[PDB]
Amino acid sequence: FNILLATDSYKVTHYKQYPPNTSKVYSYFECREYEETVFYGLQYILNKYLKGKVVTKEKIQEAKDVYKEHFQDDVFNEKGWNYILEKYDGHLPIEIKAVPEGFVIPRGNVLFTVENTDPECYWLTNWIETILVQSWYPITVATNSREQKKILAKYLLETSGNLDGLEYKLHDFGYRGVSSQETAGIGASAHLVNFKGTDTVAGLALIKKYYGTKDPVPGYSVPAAEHSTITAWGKDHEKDAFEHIVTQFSSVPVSVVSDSYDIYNACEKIWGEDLRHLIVSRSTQAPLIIRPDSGNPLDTVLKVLEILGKKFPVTENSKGYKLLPPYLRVIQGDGVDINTLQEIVEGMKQKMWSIENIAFGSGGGLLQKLTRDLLNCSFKCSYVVTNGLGINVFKDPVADPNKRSKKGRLSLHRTPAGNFVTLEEGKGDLEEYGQDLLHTVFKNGKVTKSYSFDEIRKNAQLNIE
Amino acid sequence: FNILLATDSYKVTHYKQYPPNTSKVYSYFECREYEETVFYGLQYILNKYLKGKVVTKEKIQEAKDVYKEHFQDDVFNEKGWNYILEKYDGHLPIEIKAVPEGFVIPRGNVLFTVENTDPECYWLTNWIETILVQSWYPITVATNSREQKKILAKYLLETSGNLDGLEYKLHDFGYRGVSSQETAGIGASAHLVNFKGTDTVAGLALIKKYYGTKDPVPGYSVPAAEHSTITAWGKDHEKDAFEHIVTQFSSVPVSVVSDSYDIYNACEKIWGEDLRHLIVSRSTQAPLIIRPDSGNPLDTVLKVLEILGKKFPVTENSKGYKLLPPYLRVIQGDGVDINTLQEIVEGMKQKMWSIENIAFGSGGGLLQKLTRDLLNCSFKCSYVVTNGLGINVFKDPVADPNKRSKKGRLSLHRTPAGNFVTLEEGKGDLEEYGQDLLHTVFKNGKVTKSYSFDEIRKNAQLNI
Ligand SMILES: O=C(/C=C/c1cccnc1)NCCCCC1CCN(C(=O)c2ccccc2)CC1
Numbered sequence: 006f007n008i009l010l011a012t013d014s015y016k017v018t019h020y021k022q023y024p025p026n027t028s029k030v031y032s033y034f035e036c037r038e039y040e041e042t043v044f045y046g047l048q049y050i051l052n053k054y055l056k057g058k059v060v061t062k063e064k065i066q067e068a069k070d071v072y073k074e075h076f077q078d079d080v081f082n083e084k085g086w087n088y089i090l091e092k093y094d095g096h097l098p099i100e101i102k103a104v105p106e107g108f109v110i111p112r113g114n115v116l117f118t119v120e121n122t123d124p125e126c127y128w129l130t131n132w133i134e135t136i137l138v139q140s141w142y143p144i145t146v147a148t149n150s151r152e153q154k155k156i157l158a159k160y161l162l163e164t165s166g167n168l169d170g171l172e173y174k175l176h177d178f179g180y181r182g183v184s185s186q187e188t189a190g191i192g193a194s195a196h197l198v199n200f201k202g203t204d205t206v207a208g209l210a211l212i213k214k215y216y217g218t219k220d221p222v223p224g225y226s227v228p229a230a231e232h233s234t235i236t237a238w239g240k241d242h243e244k245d246a247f248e249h250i251v252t253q254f255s256s257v258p259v260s261v262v263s264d265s266y267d268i269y270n271a272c273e274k275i276w277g278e279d280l281r282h283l284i285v286s287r288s289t290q291a292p293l294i295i296r297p298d299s300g301n302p303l304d305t306v307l308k309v310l311e312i313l314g315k316k317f318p319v320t321e322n323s324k325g326y327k328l329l330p331p332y333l334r335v336i337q338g339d340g341v342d343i344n345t346l347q348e349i350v351e352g353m354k355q356k357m358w359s360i361e362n363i364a365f366g367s368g369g370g371l372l373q374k375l376t377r378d379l380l381n382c383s384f385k386c387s388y389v390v391t392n393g394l395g396i397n398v399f400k401d402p403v404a405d406p407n408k409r410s411k412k413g414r415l416s417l418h419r420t421p422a423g424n425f426v427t428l429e430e431g432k433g434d435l436e437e438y439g440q441d442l443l444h445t446v447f448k449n450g451k452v453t454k455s456y457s458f459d460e461i462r463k464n465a466q467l468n469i470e
Numbered sequence: 471f472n473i474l475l476a477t478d479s480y481k482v483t484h485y486k487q488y489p490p491n492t493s494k495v496y497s498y499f500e501c502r503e504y505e506e507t508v509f510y511g512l513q514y515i516l517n518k519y520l521k522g523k524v525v526t527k528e529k530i531q532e533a534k535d536v537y538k539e540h541f542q543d544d545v546f547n548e549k550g551w552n553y554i555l556e557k558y559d560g561h562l563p564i565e566i567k568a569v570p571e572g573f574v575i576p577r578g579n580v581l582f583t584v585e586n587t588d589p590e591c592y593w594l595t596n597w598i599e600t601i602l603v604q605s606w607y608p609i610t611v612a613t614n615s616r617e618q619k620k621i622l623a624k625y626l627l628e629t630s631g632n633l634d635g636l637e638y639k640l641h642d643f644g645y646r647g648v649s650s651q652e653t654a655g656i657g658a659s660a661h662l663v664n665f666k667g668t669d670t671v672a673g674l675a676l677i678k679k680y681y682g683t684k685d686p687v688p689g690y691s692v693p694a695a696e697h698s699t700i701t702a703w704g705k706d707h708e709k710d711a712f713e714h715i716v717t718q719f720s721s722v723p724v725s726v727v728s729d730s731y732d733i734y735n736a737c738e739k740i741w742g743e744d745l746r747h748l749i750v751s752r753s754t755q756a757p758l759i760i761r762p763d764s765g766n767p768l769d770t771v772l773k774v775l776e777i778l779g780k781k782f783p784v785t786e787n788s789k790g791y792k793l794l795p796p797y798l799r800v801i802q803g804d805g806v807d808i809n810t811l812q813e814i815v816e817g818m819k820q821k822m823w824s825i826e827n828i829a830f831g832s833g834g835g836l837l838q839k840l841t842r843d844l845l846n847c848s849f850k851c852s853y854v855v856t857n858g859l860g861i862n863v864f865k866d867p868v869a870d871p872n873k874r875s876k877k878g879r880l881s882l883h884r885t886p887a888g889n890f891v892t893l894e895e896g897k898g899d900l901e902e903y904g905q906d907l908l909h910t911v912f913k914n915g916k917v918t919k920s921y922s923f924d925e926i927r928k929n930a931q932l933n934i
Pocket residue numbers: 170173174176177178179202204226227228229230258259260261292294296334335336338361362363364366478480
């Protein structure tokens with residue numbers, strides 16, 4: 006990895022574009038006015054990419070060589086990068102301030118700020134815009150996950166009277182449906198801020214290396230079947246596959262995909278009649294979890310439940326809702342995103358089925374079907390010093406007021422009612438509001454303030470009680 | 471990187487689930503059921519992740535230790551992975567066949583197949599599903615970018631006489647808009663299959679390392695402003711910023727974002743009146759490229775062109791379409807995806823503006839606004855041998871016929887009309903449809919067949 010090759014091409018040319026006699030470029034990050042976001046992921050970037058000796062003589066040559074061919078021109082700030090190497094032993098002369106990781110903050114608020122600590126390195130602040138803005142992803146995944154936990158919480162509490170097992174109600178299936186290996190790790194870590202169940206293994210090693218937990222691992226899974234693991238038996242021997250798998254895993258929770266050929270047959274005849282004897286003998290700590298995987302998600306879940314309720318002993322009510330026997334549960338893992346999750350739980354409630362009956366799995370919707378536009382994650386310059394004189398700067402495009410950016414030196418404060426407010430124009434310097442809620446997390450090549458994953462999870466809790 | 475920790479956790483438990491006495495698991499990849507896809511990206515994966523000694527005693531132990539806590543149990547197949555280490559010096563006993571990279575293939579065709587080459591390693595075929603399926607991404611980016619080149623080609627050809635400058639008409643802006651550094655490299659590389667213009671400076675090193683070009687680099691850029699380099703001058707000094715930037719870059723092409731405060735004022739008064747003398751003096755080798763960056767993408771572009779054609783000398787084409795003077799162009803890099811790209815070029819054509827006047831930039835739309843559902847990229851088992859007998863294997867869910875998978879030994883063939891067909895059930899073994907078009911690209915830890923990025927580009931060319 007070469008930090009000199011980890012920016013937008015045009016930013017290689019920006020040092021020649023700022024006003025001459027500019028000693029400071031100050032920039033901030035916001036989710037431009039999902040009315041509330043989880044700040045997560047910066048610490049990963051600081052450690053992996055920005056910390057320590059990130060500039061060497063070889064990295065300067067490498068970049069020089071590439072940019073020459075790439076631009077067909079000698080645009081590249083070799084002098085500027087040599088200065089960092091010579092004066093700071095290749096450590097970035099940058100200070101970053103940030104709200105604690107895990108903090109849940111309404112949109113339109115400053116989440117972190119970036120400025121150079123050396124007047125020569127004025128160009129450096131926005132060189133690292135590209136890398137830092139990619140924090141949009143862990144933030145958006147953590148936020149979207151939490152918002153889905155909010156819906157589950159609402160309906161679990163309503164139908165059941167509590168929240169038992171909530172943190173296992175959305176399972177991460179997103180590993181293969183993601184753009185890369187690195188994305189898998191970052192994204193599965195963000196989901197684990199809210200839940201404890203994951204099939205995306207990459208996230209466990211990221212967390213332990215960059216954040217850490219008191220617990221040996223932040224995430225957990227159970228034995229589960231695949232379509233290959235059923236279909237390999239031959240279409241006439243689906244029952245032999247089912248029987249073999251529940252028996253191999255008789256003592257632990259086991260999930261078995263049941264829609265290879267006909268899910269409704271599989272539930273009514275195979276599980277409900279042929280193999281019922283192997284199911285009803287199962288421990289409460291080791292349910293069979295039937296996994297539908299196709300058809301309309303709502304329509305299929307409801308039909309699966311109606312089938313099963315008539316083949317197995319249903320109890321009712323502490324809230325009036327119906328509950329499968331303890332050794333039998335369902336997991337819906339196809340076509341689940343924030344939109345369809347809400348339609349499924351609402352449809353179940355309408356049909357008198359408790360949310361304690363179901364868990365969800367999500368792949369693409371959970372990790373890949375997200376974009377920087379969702380929360381309008383943006384990084385903009387708000388303050389510059391030119392000729393020893395500070396000015397408050399901003400953009401304000403005529404045709405789009407929603408793209409207007411903040412002015413001057415910023416700070417994040419607690420309001421009298423206990424909410425959040427960003428102060429602009431250096432106004433935080435007055436003592437009218439609180440202490441600044443942002444902390445220096447990186448300065449001159451060193452991470453100066455760290456958070457464990459246990460603190461992050463704590464910070465990102467839902468209110469309910 | 472540890473390949474024992476690079477799978478869906480449930481696949482850790484799959485070796486216990488296949489029928490006893492299974493010696494062969496044979497699986498394939500398809501874009502199930504955007505009628506044609508560019509096959510790109512597998513080679514990166516083979517080289518980065520699957521080739522060489524991928525298994526060590528340390529990697530086995532690490533995986534053992536993680537999975538013990540992850541499952542709260544001992545389900546990890548230590549014995550199976552130790553057999554690889556001992557027998558094959560940590561090299562995977564797997565064979566993969568694949569269509570040549572860059573190949574443009576209709577949906578529903580086999581693109582690659584995977585099978586184990588040792589009976590002991592029957593569970594290994596689908597262990598590497600997860601990693602291989604991430605192919606969906608370079609394939610989907612390459613396909614979507616090509617589709618966008620098709621639209622541009624159609625409209626450039628119609629409004630001007632030709633396709634001059636086509637390969638520079640969609641610029642990659644997506645570096646900050648993707649999920650990671652690795653994603654940036656993969657995705658920008660995939661866009662470069664179709665175009666030469668990029669600001670995503672991670673795709674170049676990927677291409678040189680895994681694919682290679684004859685030219686020093688596969689992608690190019692020019693000097694350009696961002697809002698910070700305009701806005702830092704102060705609101706009242708936007709003209710000073712413009713003048714400074716174009717003077718610093720007066721002999722090369724330069725893009726200048728002009729919507730910091732008022733895009734329409736900047737074009738008509740600042741570029742069109744105040745600084746006109748610095749624009750009209752520019753070389754044809756070095757146009758000023760005005761960059762709008764907000765508002766309705768089509769309404770903005772059209773008003774931008776109208777403004778400018780009335781401040782600068784416009785010429786009318788051999789096709790009847792209007793053309794800015796050679797030192798002035800436009801790049802629209804906000805809200806551009808395949809849908810809005812089409813609407814802009816059509817709206818331009820309707821108002822008699824040639825596509826030679828414009829280039830596009832695209833960020834999240836080009837590299838992030840994509841899913842595995844778009845082309846239905848899917849890896850499925852189609853053939854197994856158990857107790858010495860091979861059986862054709864498949865799923866066929868009652869409520870979704872579009873999820874049905876292919877049966878038995880698969881093969882890709884050329885039809886009598888010169889099209890593609892996938893033959894199932896080992897029927898390719900009959901000499902009826904000629905030679906199998908898939909090539910062995912990986913076998914027993916070695917890459918056996920590979921392609922230059924120059925070959926890939928050539929394969930991915932448009933008919934036009
Ligand atoms: O099925 C898959 C993975 C599928 C997959 C993975 C990757 C790619 N493609 C497909 N994994 C099985 C995970 C189950 C985890 C927990 C066990 C404990 N649990 C209940 O006991 C339960 C309580 C109440 C309601 C339901 C269940 C809640 C769910």
